[PDB]
């Protein structure tokens, strides 16, 4: 084979349609389904799979008690076929660690996993199932990565890392990898102030990433990466549509070389597709909780500080619990453009449901269409009382 | 394909990083996971798998009562993907027997398994999934083998066997196999006095094996095998760092043409990487029990009887139960050197935990790195009370 190149444009997005859904909790009630968090979707040239970090226990086991904590020596990155639940008998382990990211470059898959204590943390870069290279910490404060998939161009796969306070300035770096090896890295630049958990996609040029600001505001940072030059810049989305959670109420005028204030030290992973007029943003419905989920068509959101939605679609009702979301694409599909897709984590259990001592998620994902299609709701459908 | 040749050197080892972990017991609490012992790791040209001897029962079944005994007609060698638990639905059986070893020569896999009564025991050599050759006993006292993987060079795979008292002199032999057939064998020679359960790795020349002395001392034997000449020698490690378990307290000066005394008729499987300055030894923390595990960098340990550690890493805390350990390598990986790796068995249940009537293990493994990475702990994380 050869390396995948970013040559096609994005398809026009008129509506979204369902791509996949595992119903992991509904199944888990009576079967050997693993407890997971932080799911994402990624495709190889001929296959799409779900990825997630498991807790080293099944939903109904007794070791499911306390799964609310996310950094432990029992966590690992697993992969399983789309729309199947993450069962113990069909999952493959990709790596070990409490935080990770992965992607395919057209020849093979790269996977980066972070493990260790909060200070003396480390990351191991795997390629084609072999460990290749390692990274130690620099700030010594819970090294973090993207969670969602990475995008490669001609063999080069930029990856975003953070080490430092999650409630203050932090040192972030972009590493450029090829076949698992480090070509170079850069200190992050531009006007964004705090970067975490970036969701990225490529088009015909560079790679665009939507990230979380977990310090000052509800205004998401955007990173623009040029994989050939291996250079980048950053800014916030200039739009009076806030997308983080929690968030203050939407202003009439947005700003973008400064985070929009009002909700400190918090936020969630999310995504956007920025394409001039063909621009869509995702967010929760609730401004105070991880509940509901919607897509809004907001033309020129990246640069127009008075832009407002002109079209949209409800994915998850605000009556239903939501979770982290992010973007993905099939870069090997036939056609002259890429079909944009995204996924949403549906979180059940603690801390919102205190009747159980575990936490878990189900996953739903959707892809764009050029047709105007109808809409429906996508809850996980699990009855918490069945687990009591 | 062709045969694998031992042509590359060892990589510099500055630190160890996690390679894999199954969490078999934590999962087993609520699922159909098999009871095993004596795990090891071995790789084919494109895949790494865990190997272990199963007891013919699941952890939560009623036949798990009494699994403490290790020689029975219900034992078999199984293989399953790295970091997955040894479940009943994803394991492949390689052979039947209570003691075994295996390895890949670049074209196919060889597997040797021992079965039978304590006196009229026998071994069957399999190759490419067919039985090829058989070996009967010579001393008639529980024929034993290496447990961990074997190393092949240009098709020849030396294997170490023992038949005789485990508490006195015994007859040991080295067999040289090719494509499952016996080319020759040799009575063991050199100055080592008692050899069991050898852990071997190759470099650019020969094959180096670290073995257990289960009779006179805490000073591990080393066997040096030349696979081309099909000849060998032996000695003990000349280092005042004892590595067996139980062991007396470390002396100031070691010795090596005689076992270091003080703890008779006991000991465990373990390993070392001997490479002049780039020398690392593994051992338990406890001197009296199979608890904890650490790696020590002890330059020139093979020959310097006053050498002491200059660097090290804790793998398992002494608060946690440990078990057998050993070495392995991926001999098909890209690069100019071999990345050294090792594994540790974590034993749970009887005889240390008398609240349950079974025994089982979880497995963790690590590989070297040239970077200086931090360290963490790797317990299995199972709550014994959940099984009561």
């Amino acid at each position, epitope marked *: 084979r050869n390396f995948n190149n970013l040559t096609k444009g994005l398809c026009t997005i008129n509506s979204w349609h369902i791509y996949g859904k595992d119903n992991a909790v509904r199944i888990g009630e009576s079967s050997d389904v693993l407890v997971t968090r932080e799911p994402y979707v990624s495709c190889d040239p001929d296959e799409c799979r779900f990825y997630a970090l498991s807790q080293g226990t099944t939903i109904r086991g007794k070791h499911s008690n306390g799964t609310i904590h996310d950094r432990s020596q029992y966590r690992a990155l697993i992969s399983w076929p789309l729309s199947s639940p993450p069962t113990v008998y069909n999952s493959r382990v990709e790596c070990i660690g409490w935080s990770s990211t992965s992607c395919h470059d057209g020849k093979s898959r790269m996977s980066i996993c972070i493990s260790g204590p*909060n200070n003396n943390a480390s990351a191991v870069v795997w390629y084609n199932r072999r460990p290749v290279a390692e990274i130690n910490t620099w700030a010594r404060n*819970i090294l973090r990565t993207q969670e969602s998939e990475c995008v490669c161009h001609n063999g080069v796969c930029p990856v975003v890392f953070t080490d430092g306070s999650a409630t*203050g*300035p932090a040192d972030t770096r972009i590493y450029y990898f090829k076949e698992g090896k480090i070509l170079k890295w850069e200190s992050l630049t531009g006007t964004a102030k705090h970067i975490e958990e970036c969701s990225c996609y490529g088009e015909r040029t560079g790679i665009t990433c939507t990230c979380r600001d977990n310090w000052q505001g509800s205004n998401r940072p955007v990173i623009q990466i040029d994989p050939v030059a291996m250079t980048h810049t950053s800014q916030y989305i200039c739009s009076p549509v806030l997308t983080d959670n929690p968030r203050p109420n939407d202003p009439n005028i947005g700003k973008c070389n400064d985070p929009y204030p009002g909700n*400190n030290n*918090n936020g969630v992973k999310g995504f956007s597709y920025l394409d001039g007029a063909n621009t869509w943003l995702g967010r929760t419905i609730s401004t105070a909780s991880r509940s509901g989920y919607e897509m809004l068509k907001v033309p020129n959101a990246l640069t127009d500080d008075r832009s407002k939605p002109i079209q949209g679609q409800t994915i998850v009702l605000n009556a239903d619990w939501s979770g982290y979301s992010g973007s993905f694409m099939d870069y090997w599909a036939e056609g002259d453009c890429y079909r944009a897709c995204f996924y949403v984590e549906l979180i059940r259990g603690r801390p919102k449901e205190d009747k159980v001592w575990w936490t878990s998620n189900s996953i739903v994902s959707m892809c764009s269409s050029t047709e105007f299609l109808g809409q429906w709701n996508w809850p996980d459908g699990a009855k918490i009382e069945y687990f009591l | 394909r062709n045969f694998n040749n031992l042509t590359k050197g060892l990589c510099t080892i500055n630190s160890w990083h996690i390679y894999g972990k199954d969490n078999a017991v934590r999962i087993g609490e609520s699922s159909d996971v098999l009871v095993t012992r004596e795990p090891y790791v071995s790789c084919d040209p494109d895949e790494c798998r865990f190997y272990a001897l199963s007891q013919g029962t699941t952890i939560r079944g009623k036949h798990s009562n009494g699994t403490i005994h290790d020689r029975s007609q219900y034992r078999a060698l199984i293989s399953w993907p790295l970091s997955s638990p040894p479940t009943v639905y994803n394991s492949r059986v390689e052979c039947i027997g209570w003691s075994s070893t295996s390895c890949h020569d670049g074209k196919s896999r060889m597997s040797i398994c021992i079965s039978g009564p304590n006196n009229n025991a026998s071994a069957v050599v399999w190759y490419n999934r067919r039985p090829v050759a058989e070996i009967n006993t010579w001393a008639r006292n529980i024929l034993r083998t290496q447990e961990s993987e074997c190393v092949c060079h240009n098709g020849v795979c030396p294997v170490v066997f023992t038949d005789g008292s485990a508490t006195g002199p015994a007859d040991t032999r080295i067999y040289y196999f090719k494509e499952g057939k016996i080319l020759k064998w040799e009575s063991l020679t050199g100055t080592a006095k008692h050899i069991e359960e050898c852990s071997c790795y190759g470099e650019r020349t020969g094959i180096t094996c670290t073995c257990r002395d289960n009779w006179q001392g805490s000073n591990r034997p080393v066997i040096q095998i030349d696979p081309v000449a099909m000849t060998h020698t032996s000695q003990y490690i000349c280092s005042p760092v004892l590595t067996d378990n139980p062991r007396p307290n470390d002396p100031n000066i070691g010795k090596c043409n005689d076992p270091y005394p003080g703890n008779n008729n006991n000991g465990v499987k373990g390993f070392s990487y001997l490479d002049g300055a780039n020398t690392w030894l593994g051992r338990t923390i406890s001197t009296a029990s199979r608890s904890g595990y650490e790696m020590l960098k002890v330059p020139n340990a093979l020959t310097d009887d006053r050498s002491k550690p200059i660097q090290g890493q804790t793998i398992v805390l002494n608060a946690d139960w440990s078990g057998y350990s050993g070495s392995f390598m991926d001999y098909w990986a890209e690069g100019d050197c071999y990345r050294a790796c090792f594994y540790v068995e974590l034993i749970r249940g009887r005889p240390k935990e008398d609240k349950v009537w079974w025994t089982s293990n979880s497995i963790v493994s690590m590989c070297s790195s040239t970077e200086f990475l931090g360290q963490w702990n790797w*317990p299995d994380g199972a709550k014994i009370e959940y099984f009561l």
Partner: antibody
Amino acid sequence: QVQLEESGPGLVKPSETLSLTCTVSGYTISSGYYWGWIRQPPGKGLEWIGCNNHRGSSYYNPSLKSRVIISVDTTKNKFSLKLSSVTAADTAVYYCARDPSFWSSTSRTSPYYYGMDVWGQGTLVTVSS
Amino acid sequence: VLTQPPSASGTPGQRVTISCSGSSSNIGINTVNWYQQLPGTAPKLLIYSNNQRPSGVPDRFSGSKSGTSASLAISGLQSEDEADYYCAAWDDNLNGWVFGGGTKLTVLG
């Protein structure tokens, strides 16, 4: 010897933001030790709130973060604590303290996590109508 | 949260101990500190790094840790040692200073 002293209102109404300031004297805080705050309800034990340094590398108690801000003014050798939406449960003695952890004291022979060696005398804050 | 008994006691001159315990994310991995609070003031650090003490702390105060539990031993109990004693440790799940509440040590007489 560095001295620490808390000051601010002893009374805040419910829902209001509480603001306390700790003045540091005898030491320039731009030098890097972490400074932070501890709470002690009148009949209870101690609770850590958070700490920060001159570079803003803050740490906060997860139960309070997003409600609480700790900042450092190197120019005036002062640091301060702010908590939005105070409630009855926030009545407590507040203390400011110095923390030499994270090798911020400029030593690598120290425990990474050390403890809090310098304490101010503290102040009592009541939340009431 | 760390666990401590609510009280401890002994007569002058006796050796008494205060225990502290729970989890693998905190004292089970990191070091443990002990602080002493008198009724009218801020707590003083007595023990850090499991068994070290700051200059000025009497050697009658001796810390020890094993497994997932720890203790403070007070030799030569004095009337002046009546106090609220606290156990504390960094806990990686929260990533910041967990306390065990306190133990009231009463000197009898």
